Swiss-Prot record:
Oligomer. This is Myosin heavy chain kinase A. ATP binds at residues 221-226. The lineage of its organism: Eukaryota, Amoebozoa, Evosea, Eumycetozoa, Dictyostelia. Catalyzes its autophosphorylation, which is needed for enzymatic activity and phosphorylates myosin II heavy chain at a threonine in the C-terminal tail region. This phosphorylation is critical for regulating the assembly and disassembly of myosin II filament, affecting myosin localization during an array of cellular contractile events, including cytokinesis and capping of cell surface receptors as well as chemotactic cell locomotion. The N-terminus is blocked. Belongs to the protein kinase superfamily. Alpha-type protein kinase family. ALPK subfamily. Residues 13-251 form the Alpha-type protein kinase domain. Disulfide bonds: none annotated. Residues 1-251 are annotated as: Catalytic.
Length: 251
């Protein structure tokens, strides 16, 4: 949309309720230096210069995600309000030394957790939670890295405030707060033990970068540690007033 200097990107949004990816474009201006780093990625402040369609950037014939997983229509999406021209947000790049599939899997995983957030909030707990949207962006104006595969990154809204990690994906309980731990326990019980959401982290109860474990270990990226991840959560978990309010089993 905007005529100002920045760079273009193909923007991908996953929508769980129709089970499709929605493909868009946007222009963005990203700062030169990151403002934070974790173990694997760096985060950069970025501003949006508008969201558009992908009609100038045809797909052609090896596509991931596959064509049947892509919505033919993209007129409605969260990006058009949440990343509208002017918005400050965050872009995350992996450090030098992540396949194409994993960017998409991590964004899908976050959208799945966001759904679990809504389901938890429907039980009217004392504190509601929310997982941020997340999106894949192909930075198409940048030079390809080792191959004709473009530069990929993920983007999400800016969290304002003190960022805290509340548990990890392997059993750590890092704060005293109840709601995070009760949420993890909720996802375990109400999924009939088919999955658990951990790596609950963010600002207050606005969360981002969660991790799912499933018993069979498949999908949900490299952080999916299977039954081991699940058992490690169980070992350290102490039920709290929120667990009890949600009528969860003290097993
Ligand atoms: N959405 C966000 N808004 C603001 N800060 C963030 C956000 N996500 C992550 N951070 C911070 O940036 C660091 C690097 O991101 P991560 O790759 O998720 O570890 C985190 O450890 C946080 O301190
Ligand atoms: Zn509990």
């Amino acid at each position: 949309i905007s005529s100002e200097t920045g760079e273009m990107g193909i923007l991908w949004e996953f929508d769980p309720i129709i089970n499709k990816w929605i493909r868009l474009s946007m222009k963005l201006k990203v700062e030169r230096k990151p403002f934070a780093e974790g173990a694997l990625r760096e985060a950069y402040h970025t501003v949006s210069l508008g969201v558009g369609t992908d009609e100038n950037y045809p797909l052609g014939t090896k596509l991931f995600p596959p064509i049947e997983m892509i919505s033919p229509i993209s007129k409605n999406n969260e990006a058009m309000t949440q990343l509208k021209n002017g918005t400050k947000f965050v872009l995350k790049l992996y450090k030098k030394e992540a396949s194409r599939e994993l960017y998409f899997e991590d964004v899908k995983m976050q959208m799945v957790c966001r759904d679990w957030g809504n389901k938890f909030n429907q039980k009217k707990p004392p504190k509601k939670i929310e997982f941020l949207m997340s999106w894949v962006v192909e930075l198409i104006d940048r030079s390809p890295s080792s191959n004709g595969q473009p530069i990929l990154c993920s983007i999400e809204p800016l969290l304002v405030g003190e960022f805290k990690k509340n548990n990890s994906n392997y059993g750590a309980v890092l704060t005293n707060r109840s709601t995070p731990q009760a949420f993890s326990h909720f996802t375990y019980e109400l999924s009939n033990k088919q999955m658990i959401v951990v790596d609950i982290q963010g600002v207050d109860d606005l969360y981002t970068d969660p991790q799912i474990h499933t018993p069979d270990g498949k999908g949900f990226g490299l952080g999916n540690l299977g039954k081991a991840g699940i058992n490690k959560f169980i070992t350290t978990h102490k039920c709290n007033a929120v667990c009890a309010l949600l009528d969860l089993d003290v097993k």
